[PDB]
Design a protein around this motif. Structure first.
Motif, PDB file in Angstrom:
ATOM      1  N   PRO A 129       0.960  -0.979  -0.037  1.00 38.21           N
ATOM      2  CA  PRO A 129      -0.263   0.225   0.540  1.00 38.21           C
ATOM      3  C   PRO A 129       1.138   1.595  -0.064  1.00 38.21           C
ATOM      4  CG  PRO A 129      -0.760  -1.907   0.802  1.00 38.21           C
ATOM      5  CD  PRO A 129       0.634  -2.054   1.079  1.00 38.21           C
ATOM      6  N   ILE A 130       1.893   0.769   0.678  1.00 34.12           N
ATOM      7  CA  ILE A 130       2.806   2.119   0.251  1.00 34.12           C
ATOM      8  C   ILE A 130       3.779   2.186  -0.902  1.00 34.12           C
ATOM      9  CG2 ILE A 130       5.016   3.126   1.363  1.00 34.12           C
ATOM     10  CD1 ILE A 130       4.725   1.031   3.450  1.00 34.12           C
ATOM     11  N   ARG A 131       3.429   0.920  -1.179  1.00 39.04           N
ATOM     12  CA  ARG A 131       4.441   1.707  -2.742  1.00 39.04           C
ATOM     13  C   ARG A 131       3.147   2.115  -3.614  1.00 39.04           C
ATOM     14  NH1 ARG A 131       6.355  -4.764  -2.544  1.00 39.04           N
ATOM     15  NH2 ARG A 131       8.880  -4.094  -1.547  1.00 39.04           N
ATOM     16  N   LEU A 134       0.266   6.585  -6.543  1.00 45.49           N
ATOM     17  CA  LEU A 134      -0.739   7.220  -6.626  1.00 45.49           C
ATOM     18  C   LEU A 134      -0.418   9.013  -6.500  1.00 45.49           C
ATOM     19  CD1 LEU A 134      -2.389   8.106  -4.040  1.00 45.49           C
ATOM     20  CD2 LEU A 134      -3.151   8.347  -6.268  1.00 45.49           C
ATOM     21  N   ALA A 135       0.441   8.985  -5.841  1.00 43.18           N
ATOM     22  CA  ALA A 135       0.477  10.710  -5.425  1.00 43.18           C
ATOM     23  C   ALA A 135       1.749  11.199  -6.658  1.00 43.18           C
ATOM     24  CB  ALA A 135       1.233  10.526  -3.911  1.00 43.18           C
ATOM     25  N   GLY A 136       2.619   9.903  -7.091  1.00 41.20           N
ATOM     26  CA  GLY A 136       3.500  10.475  -8.177  1.00 41.20           C
ATOM     27  C   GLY A 136       5.264  11.265  -7.439  1.00 41.20           C
ATOM     28  N   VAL A 137       4.828  10.482  -6.595  1.00 38.83           N
ATOM     29  CA  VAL A 137       6.343  11.286  -5.889  1.00 38.83           C
ATOM     30  C   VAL A 137       7.169  10.056  -5.501  1.00 38.83           C
ATOM     31  CG1 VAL A 137       4.917  11.482  -3.532  1.00 38.83           C
ATOM     32  CG2 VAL A 137       7.000  10.958  -3.642  1.00 38.83           C
ATOM     33  N   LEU A 187       3.183   9.853   5.143  1.00 38.70           N
ATOM     34  CA  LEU A 187       3.336   9.812   3.676  1.00 38.70           C
ATOM     35  C   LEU A 187       2.548  10.053   2.995  1.00 38.70           C
ATOM     36  CD1 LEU A 187       5.177   6.699   1.831  1.00 38.70           C
ATOM     37  CD2 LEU A 187       6.156   9.056   2.866  1.00 38.70           C
ATOM     38  N   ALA A 188       1.298   9.923   3.303  1.00 33.61           N
ATOM     39  CA  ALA A 188      -0.373  10.202   3.267  1.00 33.61           C
ATOM     40  C   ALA A 188      -0.961  11.483   2.935  1.00 33.61           C
ATOM     41  CB  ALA A 188      -1.598   9.339   3.671  1.00 33.61           C
ATOM     42  N   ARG A 189      -0.309  11.629   4.839  1.00 34.55           N
ATOM     43  CA  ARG A 189      -0.683  13.311   5.023  1.00 34.55           C
ATOM     44  C   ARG A 189       0.573  14.159   4.046  1.00 34.55           C
ATOM     45  NH1 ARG A 189      -0.853  14.374  11.302  1.00 34.55           N
ATOM     46  NH2 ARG A 189      -3.299  12.772  11.935  1.00 34.55           N
ATOM     47  N   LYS A 190       1.632  13.910   3.788  1.00 36.07           N
ATOM     48  CA  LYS A 190       2.072  14.848   3.215  1.00 36.07           C
ATOM     49  C   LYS A 190       2.097  14.732   1.653  1.00 36.07           C
ATOM     50  CE  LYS A 190       7.063  15.159   3.193  1.00 36.07           C
ATOM     51  NZ  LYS A 190       8.103  14.338   4.187  1.00 36.07           N
ATOM     52  N   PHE A 191       1.225  13.307   0.921  1.00 39.40           N
ATOM     53  CA  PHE A 191       1.036  13.798  -0.341  1.00 39.40           C
ATOM     54  C   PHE A 191      -0.188  14.312  -0.425  1.00 39.40           C
ATOM     55  CE2 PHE A 191       4.427  10.067  -0.505  1.00 39.40           C
ATOM     56  CZ  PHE A 191       5.778  10.954  -1.016  1.00 39.40           C
ATOM     57  N   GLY A 192      -1.245  14.433   0.595  1.00 34.04           N
ATOM     58  CA  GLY A 192      -2.805  14.698   0.323  1.00 34.04           C
ATOM     59  C   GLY A 192      -3.964  13.136   0.366  1.00 34.04           C
ATOM     60  N   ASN A 242      -7.778   0.186  -8.154  1.00 31.29           N
ATOM     61  CA  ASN A 242      -6.289  -0.535  -9.668  1.00 31.29           C
ATOM     62  C   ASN A 242      -6.271   0.296 -10.652  1.00 31.29           C
ATOM     63  OD1 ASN A 242      -7.224  -3.705  -8.916  1.00 31.29           O
ATOM     64  ND2 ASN A 242      -5.602  -2.006  -7.717  1.00 31.29           N
ATOM     65  N   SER A 243      -7.278   1.151 -11.113  1.00 40.35           N
ATOM     66  CA  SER A 243      -7.638   1.813 -12.110  1.00 40.35           C
ATOM     67  C   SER A 243      -7.094   3.462 -12.291  1.00 40.35           C
ATOM     68  CB  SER A 243      -9.020   1.469 -13.165  1.00 40.35           C
ATOM     69  OG  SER A 243      -9.687   2.213 -11.845  1.00 40.35           O
ATOM     70  N   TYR A 244      -7.119   4.225 -10.472  1.00 39.51           N
ATOM     71  CA  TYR A 244      -6.810   4.919 -10.571  1.00 39.51           C
ATOM     72  C   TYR A 244      -5.150   5.327 -11.290  1.00 39.51           C
ATOM     73  CZ  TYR A 244      -7.283   8.875  -7.731  1.00 39.51           C
ATOM     74  OH  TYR A 244      -7.737  10.558  -6.995  1.00 39.51           O
ATOM     75  N   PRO A 245      -5.744   6.361 -11.801  1.00 35.29           N
ATOM     76  CA  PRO A 245      -3.963   7.045 -12.351  1.00 35.29           C
ATOM     77  C   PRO A 245      -3.595   6.950 -11.477  1.00 35.29           C
ATOM     78  CG  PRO A 245      -5.945   8.859 -12.100  1.00 35.29           C
ATOM     79  CD  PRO A 245      -6.886   7.905 -11.945  1.00 35.29           C
ATOM     80  N   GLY A 246      -1.672   6.619 -11.819  1.00 39.87           N
ATOM     81  CA  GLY A 246      -0.540   6.246 -11.153  1.00 39.87           C
ATOM     82  C   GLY A 246      -1.039   5.171 -11.067  1.00 39.87           C
ATOM     83  N   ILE A 247      -1.700   4.522  -9.794  1.00 33.58           N
ATOM     84  CA  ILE A 247      -1.949   2.898  -9.010  1.00 33.58           C
ATOM     85  C   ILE A 247      -1.491   1.974 -10.227  1.00 33.58           C
ATOM     86  CG2 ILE A 247      -2.954   1.331  -8.577  1.00 33.58           C
ATOM     87  CD1 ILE A 247      -3.892   3.321  -6.556  1.00 33.58           C
ATOM     88  N   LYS A 248      -2.763   2.224 -11.784  1.00 34.42           N
ATOM     89  CA  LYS A 248      -2.510   1.776 -12.892  1.00 34.42           C
ATOM     90  C   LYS A 248      -1.957   1.916 -13.533  1.00 34.42           C
ATOM     91  CE  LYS A 248      -6.026   1.842 -16.898  1.00 34.42           C
ATOM     92  NZ  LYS A 248      -6.234   0.487 -16.852  1.00 34.42           N
ATOM     93  N   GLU A 249      -0.474   2.682 -14.000  1.00 31.88           N
ATOM     94  CA  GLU A 249       0.741   2.612 -14.680  1.00 31.88           C
ATOM     95  C   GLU A 249       1.315   1.252 -13.723  1.00 31.88           C
ATOM     96  OE1 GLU A 249      -1.550   4.396 -15.265  1.00 31.88           O
ATOM     97  OE2 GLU A 249      -1.214   6.533 -15.361  1.00 31.88           O
ATOM     98  N   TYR A 250       1.610   1.669 -12.574  1.00 29.78           N
ATOM     99  CA  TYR A 250       2.325   1.033 -11.881  1.00 29.78           C
ATOM    100  C   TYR A 250       2.038  -0.220 -11.914  1.00 29.78           C
ATOM    101  CZ  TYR A 250       3.468  -0.719  -7.912  1.00 29.78           C
ATOM    102  OH  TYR A 250       4.485  -2.107  -6.510  1.00 29.78           O
TER     103      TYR A 250
END
Lengths: 201, 201
Positions: free
Chosen positions: B17-19, B24-27, B72-77, B187-195
Motif C-alpha cells: 500500500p505504501i508503494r 498514486l501520489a507521483g512522488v 506520507l499520505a498526510r504529506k502527499f494529500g 487499481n485503475s486510478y491514474p498512477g496506480i494503473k500504470e504502476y
C-alpha cells in the motif's frame, strides 16, 4: 462549547489510554459504561464499527481506539511535536498494538491445559524484543517520555499496558529500570495523578 | 535534495500500500527489496524497530507500515480531507489491521496438519463482519471510495488485501458486487494503473 462522550466497557483495555488522554488534557468528558456481561447483539451491531470504544463529539462519531486516541491527542496537542515525531508516536503505538496481540495470545492460552513455559517462549522472546525497542527510544530520549519533548499518547498506551503486564506477573519493575522510570513519569504527571487516584483499581 | 527510500521484501505484504501511495501520489522514491529468505540476523537487529518496511527520507527513518502510510499520505494529500474524515481513514485502517490479524490466523491453520472448516466457521464471522462494516461505508459513499470525496490511503490498504484474499480464494468479485466495485476504482486510478501494470503478477 463542545461535549465529549466516550462509550466503552468497565475495564481499561483499549479505552483506558483514551481516558488518561482526556485527563492529561484536562478536558471533561462523559463516559457511558457498557456491560460485556450483559451486552445485547442489536446494540453492538449498531456501533459505528460494531465494537467499542466509540467517541462522540457534538454528533460526530468515531470508533477504533487507535483512531480515537489520535483524534483527541491531535486536538489536545499530545499527538506529536512535529509531523515526523507524530509518525513515531504512530510508530511506537503500532509496535504496541503488535505486542498487545502477542500478549493476548499468551494470556489467552496459559489457562488452556502441566508445564507449558514452552509457549512462554514465544512471548518472553517477543516481549523482550518489544522491551528492547522501547528501551532503545528510552535509552536515547532526553525528556523521559518515549518520543518528543513531552508526553504523547504513546507513553500512555505503553504504560497502561505495563500495568496489566505487571498484574499478569510479566513485568518486574526491578529488572527494567528504564521502563519503570517512564511508568513513574507518566503516572505522576499532572492530570493523570489525580485521575489514577480515584480510579477504580 | 533528500531521497525517498522504502526498505521491504520482494512481495506485496505490508509494504505494497505504501508503494501504491508513492505512485498514486507521483512522488519519486527508490525501493530496497529485502530477501526474506536471506535477512542476516544482525541486519534485522539494526532496523529502527527491528522490522520492515522502513521509510527513508535521507537518513530519517519511519518503522511502521501504518505510521509510514499516514505520514506520507498526510504529506502527499491522501490521508483524508477534514480532521474528522482523516480520523475515519485511520479507523478503517485499524479495522483492516484487526481483520488482517484474523486472515493470518487462518492462512496459518489453512495448511497446518483434516477438514478443519470449523476454524473456517470462525474466520467467516470475522470475514463477513469486516466486509459489512466495509459495505456500510461503501454505501454511505458518494465517491465510490471508502471515505471522503476521493481516494484515501485507507482504500489502498483495503483493496490490496482484497487481492490477496482473492488469491487465497477467500473472496469472489461477483459474490460481493460492492467491495469488488471498490477494488476496480483503485487499481485503475491514474498512477496506480500504470504502476500495477509494471509489477510482477
Amino acid at each position: 462549547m463542545p461535549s465529549y462522550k466516550l462509550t466503552y466497557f468497565f475495564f481499561r483495555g483499549l479505552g483506558e489510554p483514551i481516558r488518561l488522554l482526556f485527563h492529561l488534557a484536562g478536558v471533561q468528558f462523559e463516559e457511558v459504561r457498557m456491560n460485556p456481561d450483559q451486552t445485547w447483539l442489536d446494540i453492538k451491531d449498531s456501533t459505528p464499527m460494531k465494537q467499542l470504544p466509540v467517541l462522540n463529539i457534538d454528533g460526530f462519531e468515531l470508533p477504533q481506539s487507535g483512531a480515537i486516541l489520535r483524534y483527541l491527542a491531535r486536538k489536545f496537542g499530545f499527538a506529536g511535536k512535529t509531523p515526523e515525531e507524530e509518525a513515531w508516536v504512530d510508530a511506537v503505538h503500532d509496535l504496541f498494538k503488535d505486542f498487545l496481540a502477542e500478549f493476548k495470545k499468551f494470556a489467552a492460552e496459559r489457562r488452556s491445559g502441566e508445564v507449558e513455559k514452552f509457549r512462554s517462549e514465544f512471548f518472553l522472546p517477543a516481549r523482550n524484543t518489544y522491551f528492547n525497542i522501547l528501551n532503545g527510544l528510552l535509552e536515547k530520549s532526553n525528556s523521559g517520555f518515549l518520543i518528543g519533548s513531552d508526553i504523547t499518547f504513546a507513553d500512555l498506551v505503553v504504560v497502561d499496558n505495563l500495568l496489566t503486564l505487571k498484574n499478569y506477573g510479566l513485568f518486574d519493575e526491578s529488572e527494567f529500570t528504564k521502563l519503570a522510570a517512564l511508568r513513574e513519569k507518566v503516572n505522576s504527571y499532572p492530570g493523570i495523578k489525580e485521575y489514577i487516584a480515584k480510579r477504580p483499581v
